[PDB]
A paper describes a structure:
HRSV belongs to the Mononegavirales order with the non-segmented negative-strand RNA genome fully coated by the viral [name] N. The resulting helical nucleocapsid (NC) shields the viral genetic material from recognition by the innate immune system while serving as template for replication and transcription by the viral RNA polymerase complex, thereby constituting a potential drug target. The helical HRSV nucleocapsid is a template for the viral RNA synthesis and a scaffold for the virion assembly. The helical NC, together with the RNA polymerase L, its phosphoprotein cofactor P and the transcription factor M2-1, form the HRSV RNA synthesis complex that constitues the minimal infectious unit of the virus. We explore the polymorphism of the nucleocapsid-like assemblies, report five structures of the full-length particles and two alternative arrangements formed by a C-terminally truncated [name] mutant, and demonstrate the functional importance of the identified longitudinal interfaces.
Indeed, the HRSV NC reveals itself as a right-handed “super-helix”, defined by a 105.3 Å rise and a 149.5° twist, generated by helical repetition of asymmetric units composed of 16 N protomers forming a ~1.5 turns left-handed spiral staircase. Indeed, an additional 3D refinement within a mask enclosing ~1.5 turns resulted in a 3.5 Å average resolution map of a five protomer-subsection in the middle of the mask, which however rapidly deteriorates towards the mask periphery due to a progressive loss of regularity. The structure of the N-RNA protomer is again largely the same as in the crystal, with RMSD less than 1 Å over 378 backbone residues for each of the five protomers, and the inter-protomer contacts maintained. The variation of the protomer tilt is visible even on the five protomer-subsection of the helix. Another striking observation is that three consecutive “nearly standing” protomers in the lower turn interact with the upper turn through their CTD-arms, which are therefore better defined than in the other protomers where they are not constrained. Indeed, inspection of the CTD-arm densities in the five protomer-subsection and in the entire asymmetric unit shows that the definition of the CTD-arm of each protomer Ni depends on the position and orientation of the protomer(s) located immediately above (i.e., Ni+10, Ni+11 and Ni+12). Although modelling of the CTD-arm after the residue 3796 would be unreliable, a rigid body fit into the subsection map indicates that the three “nearly standing” subunits of the helical HRSV NCs do show densities extending beyond.
Numbering used by the authors:
A (entry chain C), B (entry chain B), C (entry chain A), D (entry chain D), E (entry chain E): 2 to 379
Write the structure that this text describes.
Amino acid sequence: ALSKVKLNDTLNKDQLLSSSKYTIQRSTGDSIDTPNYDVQKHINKLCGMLLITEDANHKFTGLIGMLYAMSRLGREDTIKILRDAGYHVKANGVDVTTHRQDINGKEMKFEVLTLASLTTEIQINIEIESRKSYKKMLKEMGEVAPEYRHDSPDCGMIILCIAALVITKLAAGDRSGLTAVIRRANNVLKNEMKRYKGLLPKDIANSFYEVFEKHPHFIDVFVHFGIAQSSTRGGSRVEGIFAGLFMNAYGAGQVMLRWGVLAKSVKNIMLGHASVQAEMEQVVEVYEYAQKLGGEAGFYHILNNPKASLLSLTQFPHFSSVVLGNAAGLGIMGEYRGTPRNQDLYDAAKAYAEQLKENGVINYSVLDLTAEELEAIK
Amino acid sequence: ALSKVKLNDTLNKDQLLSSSKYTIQRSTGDSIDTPNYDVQKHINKLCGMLLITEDANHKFTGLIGMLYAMSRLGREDTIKILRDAGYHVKANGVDVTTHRQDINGKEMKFEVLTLASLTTEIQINIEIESRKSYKKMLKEMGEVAPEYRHDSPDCGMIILCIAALVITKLAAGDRSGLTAVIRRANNVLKNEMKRYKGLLPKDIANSFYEVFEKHPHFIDVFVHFGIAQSSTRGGSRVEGIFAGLFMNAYGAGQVMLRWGVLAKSVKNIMLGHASVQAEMEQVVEVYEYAQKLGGEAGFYHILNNPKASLLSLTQFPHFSSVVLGNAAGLGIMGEYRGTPRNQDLYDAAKAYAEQLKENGVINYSVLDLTAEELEAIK
Amino acid sequence: ALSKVKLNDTLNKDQLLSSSKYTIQRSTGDSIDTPNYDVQKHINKLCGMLLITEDANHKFTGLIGMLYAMSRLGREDTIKILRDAGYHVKANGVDVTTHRQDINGKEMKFEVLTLASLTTEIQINIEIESRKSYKKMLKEMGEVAPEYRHDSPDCGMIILCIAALVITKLAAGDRSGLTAVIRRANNVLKNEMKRYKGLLPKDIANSFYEVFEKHPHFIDVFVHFGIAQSSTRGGSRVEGIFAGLFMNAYGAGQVMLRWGVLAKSVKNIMLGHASVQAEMEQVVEVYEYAQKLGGEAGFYHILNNPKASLLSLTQFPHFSSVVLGNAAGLGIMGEYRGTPRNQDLYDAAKAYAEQLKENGVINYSVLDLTAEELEAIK
Amino acid sequence: ALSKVKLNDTLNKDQLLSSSKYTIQRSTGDSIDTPNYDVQKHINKLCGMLLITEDANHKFTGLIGMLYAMSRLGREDTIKILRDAGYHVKANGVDVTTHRQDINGKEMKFEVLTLASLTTEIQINIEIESRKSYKKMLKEMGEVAPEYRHDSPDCGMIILCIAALVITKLAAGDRSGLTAVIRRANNVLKNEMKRYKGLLPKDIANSFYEVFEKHPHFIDVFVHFGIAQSSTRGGSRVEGIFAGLFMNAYGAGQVMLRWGVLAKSVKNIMLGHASVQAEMEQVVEVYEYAQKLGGEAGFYHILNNPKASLLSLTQFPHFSSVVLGNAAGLGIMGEYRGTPRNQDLYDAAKAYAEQLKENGVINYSVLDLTAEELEAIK
Amino acid sequence: ALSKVKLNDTLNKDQLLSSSKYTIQRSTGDSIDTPNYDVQKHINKLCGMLLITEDANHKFTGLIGMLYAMSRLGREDTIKILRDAGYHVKANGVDVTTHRQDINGKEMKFEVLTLASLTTEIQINIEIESRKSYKKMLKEMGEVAPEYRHDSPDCGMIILCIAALVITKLAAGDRSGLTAVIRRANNVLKNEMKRYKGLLPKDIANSFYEVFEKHPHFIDVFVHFGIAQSSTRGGSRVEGIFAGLFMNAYGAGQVMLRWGVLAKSVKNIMLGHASVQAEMEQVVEVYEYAQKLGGEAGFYHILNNPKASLLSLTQFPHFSSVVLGNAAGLGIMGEYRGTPRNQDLYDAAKAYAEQLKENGVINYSVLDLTAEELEAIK
RNA sequence: CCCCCCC
RNA sequence: CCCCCCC
RNA sequence: CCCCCCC
RNA sequence: CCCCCCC
RNA sequence: CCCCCCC
């Protein structure tokens, strides 16, 4: 009768997108440099060498960080990643070489890695300014500690920690989260800031921004690396920091869904409004779709996965405005530059939410007591 | 046995129509160029010179955009798409040559793309006008940033984004959606309109009208390119914009089905009328057919698919009238030049719907709160 | 006992007709010209010169439209269709030559098509008339647009759209649908009558009437061409008009089945009559036979298929009369020249249907309205 | 126990008749002309000559019609049909020759058909009569249309339409259906009798009576021609008329079976009498036998099929009397001369049937009037 | 487990009578005349000469009719039939010779038959009496039509139609059915008695009793002849009369089984008695044996087949008693002289049967009927 | 015979 | 014929 | 279009 | 004996 | 012992 009149739209859009039998493959360019497990030691060394040298031009650092992440991923692993992401890449293998260069009269040996995008001379320079920083440190503080040196196995993870902050703030995608990444990199990694003096949140964040914006496939590489890291059994304290930071990106850009479930929990009065009970059916449909997506349903906005718009509650202006007003009333909404599309419900829900947090009676159903001892205390 | 006197008309039309044992093949003309994955880079560059050029003559941009879509699909992929759409073409290979022409006394060498429907001289004119605009740009502000030049990896998707707007607004089919395309293309892509001084929504939209009118195979190529494009697990911000614009087209020409679902949701009164319960059987059949189609049933009016008419609610004058009246009452029509077929139901349902949008009681049964203090609240 | 006195008569007749082991073959005449896919371009071009020509002699247009239909089907496809329909035709291949006629002193070269039922001088005269009309248009409006010319890929399908109208109205079998064809071809195809100045629906409809009456195999070629066309995935909007106009034919000459379903829907009282419950059993037999036939059961009257008379409800005077009376009551039948065979039931059912139409109380059982609160709001 | 005390008798007589190992073949006569598919055009033309001729000598038209039937079947198919029917006839091949006959002083060249049963001089007489009639029409009304003339592809099918009427009314087999053939051929074929001025239904009907009484094998040739004709997918309107008129014969001589099904459906009371329940088992075995036969169980009485009498309900005098009394009660038997064998049951069934026709209360349960509001209003 | 105890007795008597190893054979006597196909014409003319004659001496008409029967079957076929019936006869062939006997001074040419039991002079007397009768008839009315004379190809079949009546009524075997033969031969064959004034069914039927008792093998010749005739698909009206009149003889002598089925149909009560439920097993074995025989289960009593007596229900006095009592209750037992064996069951079943024929049963459940006022108001 | 309207 | 809106 | 906060 | 009407 | 009527 009137129960079969339903056009299941988001499920059908999902079925359309998943079941397209023609596959596109996007041209990256010439090739991507793909180290294996053996180059991981050298890449960690390079990251530490970046972090020990004072105020280096860290403009390349995002590239080295992506190299480290994909090197721990592995040759066949990153090739599988770029096959799954739909890209034509030829595996430009990475090997360890040694180049002797005569600088300032003295010719000495420095190890060199085979990179298409990164040249030998840049490595040799960053090496010489690293030596400069090392000698100045030996002059000032006498001796360098094993923790104060670039030999720690957590330098790459520190760089990718700042990258994880960047990728969390890349949900907006308009270079607005740079200040918040600065705040987070100042707050988190305090001890790394005090031990490694070469940590510059501004330069590292800007380099990661640029390498992510110019090279979209690197974002996918890093996202699956981050899911891989956040599944290992154990790790160092810095790897724990990175896992905790990257798990913040889960649910990036989907905050309307979380505020909706919160408005369900805090029981905003006007989720029973008529115009909201109108769209509650499609809201339930969206939430069930999010659950069915499950594990990755939080990384569809970090990646610009085109099934992300399937998880948007902005297409329901009544529900969107009531939930946004509810979140605003409880004060959770900060400078969230998201306008409501229904002013009346937004203002009314904001008023009730402002009212609610001030009041609040002791819920005796929650309390386990049978005899009111507080009344006895009274 | 009056329960068995039933005729299933849409299902039988579908079974007639998809189970034909004789097939036609409509010859296009001479041939269609089907570039392989190699020329994708040069096509991106061509779009880059298209957008960099000040006030460019974009009247040859629709062909280049469709060429980019064929490239990203791939040679065997686009040939498969045409052969499946019932079309004689021959696989016209695409390769890059160099043409040396002495122009204005000086001899310059250019990298030319060899195409049947696109000639060398107009490509050279594009390139030289790009050079002139590049010289002007460098003169006015000194240095061109990498973002400010033709080397961007997303000019093709920018042109295809204006194309997606055109494809969405071709449901009118009579060049009446140009104004809406202009508005949307100015609202969307503020950054790109601000950066590339040659982005004209009017010129590109008119070009895309022309290319989609003259060559009806291009529209199926583009729609299947859009469905395949919106499936890839990754993307940039501009491919994300393209997927977002495209998924607007899903359900083009079929707003009446979704407005019928809306009438079900808001529990409109005149869906219980007797002359509407007369049609509810076939309306349920149409909606069941739409669900059974599932995926592509949103792209049957963009593609001028002959199976589209089976998803029309104009054959139900009473149900169409009440649903359009409901849409009018809630004010969510706008214009929708389509007229109702039963003026009495339209006016009465519209009056009730306008009664809905101003009333609205906060249904407290929706909130599953056990607290009885709500009575004190109210 | 009296459960097995059931003479399955419609099913038995269908079994007798389908399971006959002797086949007839009917001779058509001299031959039928069956162009292959190659000549489609020039046949479309001929239709274009037909439509551009001012007030052209359209008495030779039906043959050209049918030739375009076989060209779109192809050589072996139309030969297979004629073989399956039981006709003796030999494949008169069609190819492109040049025949030069000296007219007005000058000797000109005209591209000519070699056919048996089409001469050469007819194509020459069509060409010269089109040239005169083209010159006249150039003189009047200065310049001719490509949409004002014969080269467009829509002229053939415009002619075939008028053919589809005529094929729908050919059910009456009396040349009575010429008025309806004119009205429909003026409502539909407004743009093309505004652009092409030679579209005369009267002359084209008359020529199509003539070509279908004097060559009966062209009707089967055309019906299976339409079924083949409306299966294609995509097309232009003129092929969209053709598909939409053609699928109006499905259910030509079987309106009584549809009105029987409708009279079941509106719950007309006299479907419970004793004299109608007598016939309900074999009526249900007809309906389940129609469903068993399924797809093509709508094109048995357009084709004069002998199995058409098995889908007639006029062999049930009580049920046919009550259904026609119900249809009259609701105003559906406008000028349906079909007398009811039981005047009492016809008039009584019409009276009850008229009681239905103006009355009708809004059922609140269909709507899941928990509280009928609007009653107090009234 | 006694669920297996049943002596199935109709099936036993069936196998007795069919499975007698003596198939004795009779001597027929000289031969039958069995033209192949190439004589079709000339026989069609000859039928046209007969039809356009003023008050034509139609006493040789029946042979022309049946010869057209064989020509449409084909030489080998008609030979196979005569072999299956069990006749000694040899394939007298038919070809076209030219006989130049000097008539009225002038010698003219004519197309003559070599037939043993149709000599040259009478064909020439018919042709000269056609010439006279054509000159008379041209002199009277100026110019005859090509539809008015002999070459139209359905003159033979007009002749065979009148043959089909005669075969329907040849159940009695004593030329007592000539009045019905005249009335039907006046009602049907109004346009054709308006145009072809030689159509005298009395004359053609009498000739077909004569040819089917002189040549019995023509009855089987024609019946299988009709069954083969009614199998074609499509055809002209005249072939549709012929097939629809042939379908009237299916069930010739077996009106009692269909009247019995009707008497079951109309729920006549006396089907529950004792003297009817005595024979309801044999009646249900006859109906089961008819259903088992299926397709050809309708064309047994037209043919002289030996198993004809097994499908008669007149051997059951009580059920026969009830069925025939019901049929006479409802008035559906106009002048059926068959008398009941049991008068009392006949009169009682007739009286109850007449009581049915005037009374009759609307069933409100079979009609799906679940809604008590609609139930109470009516 | 006690379904194991079934001693099947009728089937065992079957295989005992069939698989006997001592088969003692019988010599008929001298021989019998067995004409071939050629003597058919003269025997047919001779039967015509018998019929045309007024009050003709029919003492030899039975032998002449049987000679016509053998002549139509043939020579090898009648020999085969006599052999399979187990007879020792030699084929005394009969040929057409000419005998000139001078009568009353005039010598007349007559072509005559050499027959063992039919002399030359007797058939000469028949010829001359036919001539005298023709003389008288021509003098009295003047002119006689071709259907009124001896050359009719159906005079022999009129004789054999009376023979078919004889064969049906030959079950009693003691010339008791002569009045039924006369009545059936006056109802049937009224036209012939109007035409051929020699038809005395009393005389012909006495002749046929004489020829069937005097030559007991003529009964098998004739029965197989009739089964052969009723299988030829073509024949005139007299041959149709013979077929329909012969298949009356099927089931001769076995009315008891048919009336048992009939009593099962009325649902007579005394088939649930104890002393009938005892013998239901033997009754069902008899009925299954009858079904297993099938075809020839009907002509075992006309022929003197030794396996005849195994199909008698008189051996079950209680089931035979109830069946005969019932079929006397429903009236359909005429002068059947067979008294029942168990008078109590006979009378009780007859009383119940006569009680039934006053009241009507209800059979509504097969179709939808509310049946509250529909019942008892009928 | 069937068909018939509107779209 | 179908389509038509905003996004 | 979607996205925008805090950790 | 079978067939028989109207379409 | 089997058969037995009507069509």
